[PDB]
Every structure is written in C-alpha cells, then in structure tokens.
Design a protein around this ligand. Structure first.
Ligand SMILES: C[C@H](Nc1ccc2c(c1)OCCn1cc(N3C(=O)OC[C@H]3C(F)F)nc1-2)C(N)=O
Length: 895
C-alpha cells in the first residue's frame, strides 16, 4: 500500500486534483466507473506484454505512418525511377555516414542490410533498428519506407532523409518494465419492464432553493421531454410564481405513454422569467439511469447559468446532470411511483417485439398501408423511389429532411440497408416516441452494414443520443479507423465523450484502450482531457478518465508529470508578469524573468522534458539568452531549448516554442487541423498547394503552446526592411539565380490554398502582421482566433493586395492581366471545388465540436456558414460562379 499512496500522489499531480476526492463521491455510477473501467486497463497491459520487449517498444515508439502505402502520381514522380537517396548514420566510438540509393518501398530490414553492405565494402540485420536523426522517432515495424511520415515528407520537400542505425538492446534496455497494479477500489416492491406500465408520463416540480435575483418578478419552470435535440411531446410549463417564493407543488402531464419513452429520453428544464420571456437557469436529466432504471422518488437538480447567446427557453443540446456547485438554483423534483423498480426491456424482449411488428406489417392489406405514409408495401417499390433515396443520401448533414422524406425513408428502411451511408438520415426519420418503430430500428442497426469511419463519426455527435446507434459507430471505428486517422480526429472524439449519457460507454472504452496501447495517442488524449479540467461541466468525467489512464499508462506518467510541472511553472511566471509587472518596461520584465527562471526549483522544472507539442522532441537545457517576452497581445513567451539528441544538427539544434497565456487556443487548434485535412485532400487529387499547419496545443483554460516556424517573417517585418514591390524584391533577394522560379511557384501555390481555405472557413481579417512568408517563398497564416460567421453577407478575409499579385506575376506592372494570374485563379477554382466535394467531412468535424464552449461554434447555424461559402444548395458551376463573384467584389475586378 506504500506503493499505492505514492502512485496516488503522482496521479493527483498529473490530473490537478487529489485522488481521495474521487473516493469521497457517493454516486454509485462514479464508483462503478472506477471499478469497471479497469478491465480496459488490464486488456491494454496484456497487449503490451504479449511480445516483450518488441511489443513494449511498439507501445512507446509507435510507427509514425501514413494510412496507405500508395504514393500519389506527383509524389511518386519526385523519386528517381521509384528510388530514394537515404543517409544512414553509424556511431562507431564518432559519426560515420553511408549514402544509399534504394527503392521507396524498402522495408527497414532491407535498408539496414544495404547500410551494413556499404560499411563492409569500406574494408546482424535483426540486431539493429532505424531511428530518425535528431528525435525519438523509430522505424520498429516492417512498413514500406515511403509509408513513414518522415520519409513521405522528405520526398515531397526535396529533402535528404537522415536515419541512424541503433542497436535493439540500446533501445530495449532504456524502456522500463512497469507492473500494472490493481488499485484498492478494485476489491468492492418488485422489478417490472417499462413496456408493462400502462400510464402517461408525469413529473412533479416541487420548489426551488438558491433563487437569488434582483426584485425579475414572476417566474416559472419550463419542461420538455427530449431525445437528443428532438422534442418527444409538447413542452409543459408550471403556473407563474413570484421569485421571492419559488414554490409550485404541481404535477406536469406529458403527451407521452411511459412504454413509448426511448432509452436516451431526457427531461430538459429551465427556470424562466416573464411579454419578454427570459431563461434564468437550465438543467437536463436522463429519464433512465446507467442501470437502465427509470427515475423514481425525490431528486434535487442544481442548475446552470444561461450561455450568452442562448435566447431559447430550454437548452437540450446543453450538458445533462446536476451542477457540481451546490450554491446555485436547486430545483426539487418528484417522479412517479409504480410500487416496483422499472427497467428498460433487454435486447431479447425488444427483438421479439420488432419481429412481431415486422411480421404484422408484412400481412397488411393495400388499404391498411394506405392509412399511413409511414407504411408501404414490399412489391410497390419503383426504380424512381430508389433514385430519390440515393439522391437523399448524397445531401449534407445540415440539409433539412422534410416530413414527407422522413415518412418516405422510414417506409423504405429495408431498401435503405442496400445504401448503408443513408443511416444518419434514416435515424432522423424514426418516430423516437413510438416503441414499435424504435424496436424495429434497433434490429436494423444491430445488423447494419459497416460504413466509413468519417461517416460513422457523425453518429457520435449530439444528434444521435441512442446507445445502439452509438455502439454501431464505435464498432465501425474499431474495425476501420487507423491509428493515423484516430490521431488526426482525436479532438472530435474526445469532444463527443461529453454527449455520452453515462460514464461507462463503448466510446470511452475504445478511446482508453487505444490511448493505453499507443503512447502517441495516449499523449494527446491526456493533454486534450487535462486542458479541459477547469471546466466543471466535464471535470468529473475527464478526471475519472484521466485517473484510469494514469494507472495503466506505465512509465509515461513520470514523463507526463515533468511536462505538467514545467507548464505549471510557466503558468505561474506569466500570471505574475500580467498581474504584478504588466506596466513595467520589457528590460525590467526580462530581468524579473531571468532571475525567477534561474531559481533551483524553476530551473530544473523547465529543462530535461518532452515537448507537449510533439513528445518525439526532447527539450534539454533552456537557452535563457534566446528567451524573450514577445510584443504581441497577451505578451507570449518565446522559449528556446537545446535538442539534447546526439545528431541534433541534422534536424534542429534549438526547439523554439511560443508559450501563450491569455487567449483561447481551441479555435486555432481546430482551424489548423482543418487546414491539414484540406492540404491532405489537395495532395491526394494531384493538387500541390503546400499549407503550413504549425503545431498548436491548448494546455489549460486560455493557456497553450505554438510551434515556431523557422526562417519565417510577417509581411510587416518584410516591408519594414515602402513600395508594393518590396515583398517581391525580398523574395528575389532570398532566392537569387536559378532557384527564383521555385520560390514564385511555392508562393503562388501556398497563396492559392490560403485564399480558398480562409474564404471557406471565414477566418479573422488578414493583415500584414498575421500573414507570414518563409525564405523559400512559402506563404502561411497565423492567429486563427476567429472563424465562421463571427460577424452578425460572406467575407473574403484574405484580399490579395498589389504586393501578392506582383510576386505571383513575377514583377509585372499589369499583374491582373497575366498568364501567371490566370493559373493562380485555376489553382483556386480546383481547390475550392475539391473541398466542396468533401463538405460532409468538414460539416461533421464542426458538428462534433458543438459541446466545446467555443464562442463562434454554439449552434448548427454557426456551421451553416460553411454551407453558404461552399454554395451547397447551388450546382457546381453556380458554386464556382459564386466564388468568382465574392473574389471580384473584394478585389474590385479581376475575377
Ligand atoms: C523570428 C520570429 N519567428 C516567428 C514568430 C512568430 C511565429 C512563428 C515564427 O512561427 C509561426 C507560428 N506562429 C504563430 C504565432 N502567433 C499566433 O498564432 O498568435 C500570435 C502569434 C504569437 F505571438 F503567439 N506566431 C508565430 C519572427 N518572425 O518574429
């Protein structure tokens, strides 16, 4: 138990709260979560000690690979007859290099043998491993060399891959053997079915405590029964009462039969003032608990404050459950009593019912089917009907499905199985207050054909609360989501956890198992959860989840605790500079910083740890002379560490990170993720528009890290050394001679990609201080704090000034009327249309981010902006015409 107390101290330090605080939670759901999740921990630890030491090394250093070994035409043609030049370094005392020309699809074992052949010609194979020079990135698995992200990046950038031969035992001996230990908490009327209760739904509103307002006058409680965002019946209000005495003692009757209540049904309520009706406090509750039990008896629900922007009286897409703060409006509710415990029926009872319904419908006469548009006969399915179904399935997730299409999709639900990507539309067409239809939907979902992971992700958002539906989505992720794509969408998958009704669910088990079997996923999983630990709407869920992750991640908890301590020291320093030294000069502030940083406690916490931006990067000794307070808003810290890697000169000798305390970095994180997804779509279609999605990580409440791009300057820094020719002059000066055209091409291409990306996403206004350019000519944007409809009718955030057109047109006077400008336009058109073709992906990435309290992403109407910029109701020619007009009005001619 001495080991357990010390480990509980480590977990507490990592999570930010003491582990004893969980042990004090009375809630049986919380205690069952802590216990039951431990089998995911056990399965994951078993997988790691399955083929030791290799399986342990694969967990710690997973291959950083692309999803497909297939190289796009433009990328493959960058190779010399499908061959790549590679540099293999061998440490012999001294550093010896061996240059190899090998096929791109060579396995690391082939590369090692070719390297030993060259070393022998200068005068075993499975006793070595290839490492990337400069970082802790290893090639432990037998993939084609070009499938590794490092190599694919080298081919695309005309770079020389620098690999190092390392002895397997030099790596194996450095990987500590941890033993996962099961914690102390591992060792812990009648019952009737819901479908047997021949009664209507009723709930009693008793009274409200902690209703502190400005004597606001007459108040009432507004209630509704919801299934996700869909109302199951009409909303029921209490009688008006004075705020000075909030007492109702009233039963509210709902237009819903208790056996008709879906599994994920919720009571959505709010205390409203009044005619200008205004919500004061809101709260949501699950009608069934985690044990599938219908709510009974008395219950007190602590309510939440109204979000600035919500004018709606109820808030169904808000969080479910009581507010952890007990010094808030507290509404007492009483539920019905049935002289027994009521449970939702099990699968077998639901299947018997669905099979009974299917069989009964199959015997319906022509005239019976004619009574309802939701009933149709098997043989009466024409080729036109099948065409309309296929057409409906191509519509985007924000396209309204009329009541007629809903009846139509439901009556052809069996044909829908042949076009399985229609499932999200079919699910929104279901009568969720009819147990006959819901039971039939379950049986269709149970056996539904698998869909694409990016299509299944939609089924995990706020629109699909049903656990059978969510379980299907998770099964598609388990079978088809690669570790590369999981890493890419980890922020959306962590966000949708908030939409799970219960702590113990299929999604959380899938995510935890992946985090515990891949340290690269585990790292970002920990940081996305930890960064939101201040938010009291998810701190219990994320804290318990972090507790379970920290018990089984092994040795990585110790490395995480170094990054947590380094970040805390930096949060403490920046907090002092903004509260006690804000009005002092840069020199005075830098003197204060240098002194504080040099303290023994601080100095050691800020050196010798892994970059939270990229844990393959080691941060050694902090280089204090290169550290500075930046002139930008919130005055970020420019930080520089030595790369302690022996071959640091072959990658970067100093790792420079911007530490910023003051701004929400979540919108920046999402924009950068989208830019990368856009670039990925463009490269795959043979459209080389190189984007620069630099690293950005939120590490707490308005705190985070930004990856510094080396050899980059703002437009202002360029022109401050002014003519419109200054930018073109600088580029021509940085790329003198034969390499001039490559810079112009790179500028034009990066420029086209940023015009299209920023116009689609509606990014904040571009100016000279937030547009940067690398020496080689690569243009990129920084500071993505604003997106979508952030004003109140569509904007062009990136208006190409004379400066940009002069570069594009190679110094010509009439830049608007050149062949270079026409080709720049064609690049924009192609780019715009390609994104239009993947609209569902983008819409779903944003929809999964709605529970995240981001100011510009609160409703589906905020996401609707992307439907306008991508012109989705219009045809492809009309969408191109619309893009050209937006550009023309912004530029006052040219398009
Ligand atoms: C030498 C120095 N180099 C530099 C500066 C800022 C960023 C950068 C490189 O890399 C690109 C990523 N980046 C992103 C940001 N920022 C951002 O996103 O918001 C404001 C600003 C920073 F002050 F935080 N700044 C940089 C320079 N040009 O003064």
């Amino acid at each position: 138990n001495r080991e357990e107390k010390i480990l509980n101290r480590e977990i507490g330090f990592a999570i930010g709260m003491p582990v004893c605080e969980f042990d004090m939670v009375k809630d049986p759901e919380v205690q069952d979560f802590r216990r039951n999740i431990l089998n995911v921990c056990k399965e994951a630890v078993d997988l790691r000690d399955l083929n030791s030491p290799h399986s342990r090394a694969m967990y710690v250093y997973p291959p950083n690979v692309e999803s497909s070994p297939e190289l796009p035409k433009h990328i493959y043609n960058k190779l010399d007859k499908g061959q790549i030049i590679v540099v293999i370094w061998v440490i012999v005392s001294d550093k010896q290099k061996y240059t190899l020309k090998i096929n791109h699809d060579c396995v690391p074992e082939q590369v090692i043998a070719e390297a030993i052949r060259k070393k022998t010609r200068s005068m075993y194979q499975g006793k070595y491993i290839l490492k990337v020079c400069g970082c802790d990135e290893y090639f432990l698995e037998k993939y084609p060399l070009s499938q590794y992200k490092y190599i694919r990046s080298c081919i695309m950038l005309g770079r020389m891959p620098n690999l190092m031969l390392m002895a397997k035992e030099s790596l194996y001996s450095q990987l500590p053997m941890d033993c996962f230990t099961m914690p102390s908490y591992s060792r812990r009327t009648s019952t009737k079915s819901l479908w047997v209760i021949n009664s209507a739904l009723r709930i009693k509103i008793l009274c409200a405590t902690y209703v502190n307002v400005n004597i606001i006058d007459k108040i009432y409680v507004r209630t509704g029964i919801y299934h996700g965002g869909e109302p199951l019946c009409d909303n029921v209000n209490t009688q008006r009462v004075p705020c000075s005495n909030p007492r109702w003692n009233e039963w509210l009757n709902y237009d819903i039969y208790i056996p008709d209540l879906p599994r994920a049904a919720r009571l959505c309520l709010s205390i409203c003032s009044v005619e200008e009706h205004c919500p004061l406090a809101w709260g949501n509750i699950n009608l069934f608990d985690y044990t599938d039990t219908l709510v009974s008896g008395k219950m007190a629900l602590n309510l939440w404050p109204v979000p600035h922007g919500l004018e709606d009286l109820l808030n169904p897409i808000g969080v479910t459950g009581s507010n952890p703060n007990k010094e808030t409006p507290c509404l007492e509710l009483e539920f019905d009593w049935f002289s027994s415990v009521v449970k939702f029926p099990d699968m077998s009872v639901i299947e018997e019912h669905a099979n009974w319904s299917v069989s009964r419908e199959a015997g319906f006469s022509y005239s019976h089917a004619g009574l309802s548009n939701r009933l149709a006969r098997d043989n009466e399915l024409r080729e036109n009907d099948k065409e309309q179904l296929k057409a409906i399935s191509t519509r985007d997730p924000l396209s309204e499905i009329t009541e007629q299409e809903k009846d139509f999709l439901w009556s052809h639900r069996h044909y829908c199985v042949t076009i399985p990507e229609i499932l999200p539309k079919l699910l929104l067409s279901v009568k969720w207050n009819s147990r006959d239809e819901v039971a039939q939907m379950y049986c269709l979902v149970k056996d539904w054909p698998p869909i694409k992971p990016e299509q299944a992700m939609e089924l995990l958002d706020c629109n699909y609360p049903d656990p059978m539906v969510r379980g299907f989505a998770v099964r598609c992720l388990e079978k088809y989501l690669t570790d590369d794509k999981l890493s890419q969408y980890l922020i959306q998958l962590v966000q949708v956890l908030k939409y799970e009704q219960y702590l113990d669910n299929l999604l959380v088990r899938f995510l935890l198992k992946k985090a515990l079997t891949n340290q690269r996923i585990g790292h970002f999983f920990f940081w996305h959860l930890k960064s939101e630990m201040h938010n009291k709407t998810v701190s219990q869920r994320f804290g318990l989840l972090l507790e379970s992750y920290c018990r089984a991640c092994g040795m990585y908890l110790k490395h995480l605790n170094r990054q947590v301590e380094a970040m805390e020291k930096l949060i403490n320093l920046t907090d002092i500079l903004k509260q006690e030294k804000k009005d002092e000069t840069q020199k005075v502030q830098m003197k204060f910083l240098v002194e504080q940083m040099r303290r023994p406690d601080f100095m050691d916490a800020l050196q010798g740890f892994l970059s939270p931006l990229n844990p393959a990067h080691q941060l050694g000794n902090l280089r204090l002379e290169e550290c500075r307070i930046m002139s930008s808003a919130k005055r970020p810290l420019w930080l520089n560490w030595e790369n302690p890697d022996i071959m640091s000169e072959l990658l970067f000798q100093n790792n420079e990170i911007i530490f910023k305390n003051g701004d929400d970095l979540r919108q920046d994180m999402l924009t950068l993720q989208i830019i990368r997804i856009m670039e990925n779509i463009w490269q795959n279609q043979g459209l080389d528009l190189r984007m620069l999605p630099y690293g950005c990580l939120s590490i707490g409440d308005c705190v985070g890290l930004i990856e510094v791009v080396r050899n980059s300057h703002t437009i202002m820094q360029i022109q401050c050394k002014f003519n419109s020719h200054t930018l073109h002059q600088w580029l021509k000066d940085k790329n003198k001679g034969e390499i001039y055209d490559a810079a112009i091409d790179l500028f034009t291409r990066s420029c086209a990609g940023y015009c299209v990306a920023t116009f689609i996403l509606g990014i904040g206004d571009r100016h000279n201080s937030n547009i940067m350019v690398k020496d080689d000519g690569q243009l990129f944007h920084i500071d993505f704090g604003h997106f979508l409809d952030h004003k109140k009718r569509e904007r062009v955030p990136f208006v190409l000034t004379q400066d940009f057109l002069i570069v594009i047109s190679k110094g010509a006077q009439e830049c608007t009327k050149t062949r270079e400008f026409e080709r720049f336009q064609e690049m924009c058109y192609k780019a715009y249309l390609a994104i239009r073709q993947h609209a569902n992906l983008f819409i779903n990435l944003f929809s999964m981010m709605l529970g995240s309290g981001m100011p510009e992403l609160q409703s589906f109407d905020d996401i609707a902006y992307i439907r306008k910029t991508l012109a989705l109701d219009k045809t492809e020619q009309e969408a191109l015409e619309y893009f050209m007009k937006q550009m023309n009005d912004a530029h006052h001619g040219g398009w």
